[PDB]
Each structure stands twice: as C-alpha cells, then as structure tokens.
Amino acid sequence: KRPNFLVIVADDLGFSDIGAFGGEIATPNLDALAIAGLRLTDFHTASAASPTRSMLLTGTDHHIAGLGTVAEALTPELEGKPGYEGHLNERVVALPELLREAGYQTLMAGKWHLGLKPEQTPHARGFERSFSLLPGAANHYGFEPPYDESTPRILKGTPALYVEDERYLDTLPEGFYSSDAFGDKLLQYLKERDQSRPFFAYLPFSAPHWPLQAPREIVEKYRGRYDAGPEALRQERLARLKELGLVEADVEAHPVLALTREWEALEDEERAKSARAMEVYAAMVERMDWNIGRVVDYLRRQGELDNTFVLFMSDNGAEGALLEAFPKFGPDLLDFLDRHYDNSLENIGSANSYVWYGPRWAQAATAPSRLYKAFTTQGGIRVPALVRYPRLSRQGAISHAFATVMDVTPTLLDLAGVRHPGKRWRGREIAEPRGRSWLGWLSGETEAAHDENTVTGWGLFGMRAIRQGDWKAVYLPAPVGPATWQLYDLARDPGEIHDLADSQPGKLAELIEHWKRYVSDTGVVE
Ligand SMILES: [Ca+2]
Ligand SMILES: [Cl-]
Ligand SMILES: [Cl-]
Ligand SMILES: [Cl-]
C-alpha cells in the first residue's frame, strides 16, 4: 500500500486565518485535518507565489528552477541568466513527472504560475489531467477588462488564461467561480480515476488572492464581523494563537508598519468599504474550505483518506501590498479601476469589483511575525501548514520544528518509494533536491528533519535572508528597511524585533559567509 497524495495550496492565506490556526473564519474541513494532523508553526516558503511553487514541485531553490525572480519582473539584466527563465525550466525535474513514471495518476486543478506556453503547462510538466489558470492571478469570475495599451500592467499580466490538458480554453464553464471550478474539476478527475492505482492530486487555489471576490451568500455571513478593524482583529488573533499554544504566551509581536491610515483615522465610508473587503476575504477562505471539504468528503466515502498523505499550506505570507503604490510603469491603476469597475460598498466582492485589503488587515494575520508577503522576514516566509496522514507517529500536535517547502518533494518521493534520479534525467543534467525527507521526523525516529547546523537562504526583490538553526540574518533594502544586515535569535525573538548585529558580530559574520555560499550554489543575481 503506497499512499495517495493531496497537496492543497492556498494563495496568500495568512498564518492565523484558519480556525485551527487561531482564526474566526469558518473552516470546518481544514480544522478537522489540522487538529487530527500535525500543525507546523516553523514551516517556510519563499516570499512570493511562483518561487514557492517552483520549490514545492522540485525540492530545490527557486533560483535554480527557473523562477529566480517573478516572471512579471524580468528585466534585460536578468533575462538570459540561468534559473531566471520565468518558467519551470530544463535544469530540474518536477515531482509529478517522477510520480507519473512510478504509476501515479497525476491530477491538478488550480493556479499554475510556472509558465504560460504549451511546453510549460501542467500537461507538459507531468500532469495527466489538469484544469489550470496559467498566470499568477485573474478575476475569480472570469470578468475581463479591456486589454489594450491603456490597460494597467498588473491587469495585463493577469488574464483569465485557462488550459485543460493541451486545450487553451475559448470560454469558461457556466457559473464560473474559481474555487468552485477547481473543486468541480479535481472531483471529476478523482471520480474518473483508475481506482486500483494511487493518485497525486494537486489543488492550488487562487483564493484568497486579490481581487477579493466571493459568493454573496457567504459574504453575508460575515456582515459586521470586522467593524472593529484590523488592530482589534490582530489582538484577537494573538490572544487565540496563545490560547491554542501556536505561539508562546510571552512572545512580543512585531509592530504594525503601514503607510495607510489607521482604522480610527478613516472616514465612515472608507471604513465600511475596508471592512467589506475583509468580509469578502473571509468568504473566499470559507468557500475554499468548502471546496476542500467536497474533495475530502469524496475521498473519505471511497475509503481512501486515511491512505492519503494530505498536505495543506499557504504559498507565502498574507498579502499586504498596495497595488496602487508600485510605480509599475504605464497606465494608472486606480484611474482605470475607477472607469471599469464598481468598488462602491454594495458591489465589493462581485465580479466587476477589484479590491485588495492592504497592509494592516495582512499584518493582523501574519502576527506576531514581522511584515508580510514579498519580504524575507518571517511574515512573508513563515506560512501555516498541516500534514494529515494517520500512519505517521507525529499526529494530533503542534510542532515548532524548522521545515521548508523544499522538503516536500523528497518526503513524497520517499513515501511513494521512488528514488530521485540524481544528476541526470531524460538525457539532461539536473539539480538534486536541497530539502530533506520528513519521514524520519514524522515517523518519530528523530525530533526534527533539520538541526542547529542546517543553513537556508532566501532572496527576492532585493531582499535577503540566511538562517542557521535558530539564528537568522535579514537584509531589507530602502525604502522598506535599513539596507543592512540585521541579526535575530528566532528562538527568543520570533517577531524579529531585537537586532543583534552589534551584540553578536561573530555570529553575523558567520551567516554572511553562508549567504555568499547560497548565492554561488543557487546562482542568485540581485
Ligand atoms: Ca501567493
Ligand atoms: Cl452552493
Ligand atoms: Cl475551544
Ligand atoms: Cl501539542
């Protein structure tokens, strides 16, 4: 009995949004998985979507795999460089390619974000069956603005570009809502499976990523729930994180840093609309969880769930971006949205609204961590994760053992009884995994998969981190940080509040050495 796999990825879901991670959002299906399984409080991704996904499916660093930066930010000084191709590339072999070789039915419904051309599709990279959004985002209902020269760059880069296998779709199914479509499709594939062989089911939702949109009936259930604002929410989340044992009672949360007005400085109409966006966000997360529950309910009724290794994670920190703030060259976003969408209060959450919830709502969900998505601080890279598989010894608990997204490919190969092919595959030199199999740790033979000498690097958008054991050095450039290395003891200071660069210069110098090894071994160009 080799197990099935179900790998579910939420897009920009915050650490404490789910019930079992301290949240007020109704997420019964994930809660059941989480509490029965093992909740990870020290699991890490990259600081953005496509780099994480590249890592999840290869077991190595994103700077090797083709996503050295995000496809959308490829300049002339990076384009051409090895591992900056903007898609999953020729120097790695993807997890599903390997499982498919070894008998698995490879099934996917969700966001891809690992390439847009036929040769880069889930179908080209080892999925037998796939229903996929190829870009990093799109309107959840398939409502499209006009595409021409006057269109903001962020919109141009996020069309509703869907493929099913090799067919680039002409229209979308009737009543399309991304999360429901992905649920419908994976369920179709699972119902149509060869019941006698195992599956690798990949369910990368695009919820709860902007634009924030969800069925009215679900939005209505959160009416008034967020009227006290993101700081009142953050305080709630912190108290619950402590009560549940996910964060230690004495942890000091990092201060909230945002350039927007705080809740109490907002006019009544601005508040109502910002609260409505968080309600919509909450609805997206509940609807995602509902779709996950349809998938899981079917597996359970088939007698397969207990023999399915279930991994759930978010792909990066909660999204605190202000889309209007980035001097993305080209046409003005807000002015465009003003002419083509309706963001009045009663419309927010529909197909022809386009909202994001901004930095303070995001910091409520990353707390006690510092900042949010696209930073290399813990806010942007520490994400919620659960593993549910009853054969493992470590279930029903909260673990603070360090782990990364690079661990997942090796863990799953290990469980499938498939050896990584080493340095060659299909007549081509390839990278080997930098992660480590969780199986020792999760079977109870070891206390963790890594130890005090494990070294890990992150690098994206000009930011850096390097970690050894619990010691982490961070580099944030201007204007969002001091453009120097700061040193943190994550065991004592999970908030990354107390810079120890002057107190422990030897420790810092050691980490800077590791940082350079990282740069040279993964091919970081900054
Ligand atoms: Ca994401
Ligand atoms: Cl329904
Ligand atoms: Cl309780
Ligand atoms: Cl525990």
CA distances from 507 to 430, 470, 496, 500 (A): 34, 11, 16, 9
CA 247 – ligand 4 centroid, Å: 11
| Cβ contacts of 106 within 8 Å, gap of 6 or more | 96, 99, 100, 126, 127, 128, 129, 199, 200, 202
Half-sphere exposure of 60 (CA within 13 A, CB side): 25
d(CA 97, CA 255): 44
Ligand closest to 41 (CA) is 4
- Torsions phi, psi of 9, nearest 5? -125, 120
- Torsions phi, psi of 32, nearest 5? -65, -45
Q: What is the resolution of this structure in A?
A: 2.0
Return the structure tokens found at 370: 């510092």
Ligand closest to 183 (CA) is 2
Q: Which of 248, 240, 246, 239 is nearest to 491 (CA)?
A: 248
- Length of the chain (residues): 526
DSSP 8-state code for residue 73:
G
CA 204 – ligand 2 centroid, Å: 20
CA 445 – ligand 1 centroid, Å: 33
CA 22 – ligand 4 centroid, Å: 14
The domain defined by 1-448 folds into Alkaline Phosphatase, subunit A (3.40.720)
Assess whether the previous peptide bond of 479 is cis (omega < 30° from 0): yes
Other beta carbons less than 10 A from residue 328's beta carbon: 17
Neighbouring residues of the ion ligand 4, judged by CB less than 5 Å: 397-398
Q: Which of 367, 377, 387 is nearest to 463 (CA)?
A: 377
Ligand closest to 286 (CA) is 2
Edge to edge, the sheet with strand 485-489 lists 455-460, 463-468, 471-475, 485-489
Burial of 197 (0-12, 13-18, 19+ CB in 10 A): exposed
CA 7 – ligand 4 centroid, Å: 23
| Cβ contacts of 358 within 8 Å, gap of 6 or more | 258, 260, 274, 320, 321, 322
Edge to edge, the sheet with strand 199-204 lists 167-168, 162-164, 129-133, 105-111, 199-204, 4-10, 308-314, 385-388, 38-40, 398-399
Q: What approach was used to elucidate this structure?
A: X-ray
d(CA 294, CA 305): 13
Tokens 């996904």 belong to residue: 53
| Cβ contacts of 437 within 8 Å, gap of 6 or more | 407, 410, 411, 413, 414, 449
DSSP 8-state code for residue 508:
H
CA 62 – ligand 1 centroid, Å: 14
d(CA 239, CA 22): 8
Sign of the CA dihedral with 127 first, then 299, 179, and 460 last = negative
- Judged by DSSP in three states, 5 sits in strand
Q: Which of 476, 473, 455 is nearest to 526 (CA)?
A: 476
| Cβ contacts of 312 within 8 Å, gap of 6 or more | 8, 9, 10, 30, 33, 34, 292, 384, 385, 386, 388
- Angle of helix 178-191 versus helix 268-301 axis, rounded to 10: 0
d(CA 122, CA 112): 7
CA 153 – ligand 2 centroid, Å: 34
Cα dihedral 104, 107, 113, 116, rounded to 10, equals: 90
CA 78 – ligand 1 centroid, Å: 22
**CB 128, CB 122: distance < 8 Å:** no
Domain ranges of the chain: 1-448, 449-526
CA 217 – ligand 2 centroid, Å: 9
CA 407 – ligand 3 centroid, Å: 31
d(CA 287, CA 208): 10
CA 290 – ligand 2 centroid, Å: 9
Strand ranges (DSSP E) for 213-368? 308-314
Other beta carbons less than 10 A from residue 335's beta carbon: 12
CA 19 – ligand 1 centroid, Å: 20
Ligand closest to 19 (CA) is 3
Query: Cα 98 to chain center, whole Å?
Result: 23
CA 81 – ligand 3 centroid, Å: 51
Give a three-class secondary structure readout of 186-251: HHHHHHCCCCCCCEEEEEECCCCCCCCCCCHHHHHHHCCCCCCHHHHHHHHHHHHHHHCCCCCCCC
Please identify, in words, the CATH class of the domain defined by 449-526: alpha beta
CA 41 – ligand 4 centroid, Å: 11
| Amino acid letter, 342 | D
CA 14 – ligand 4 centroid, Å: 21
**CB 23, CB 236: distance < 8 Å:** no
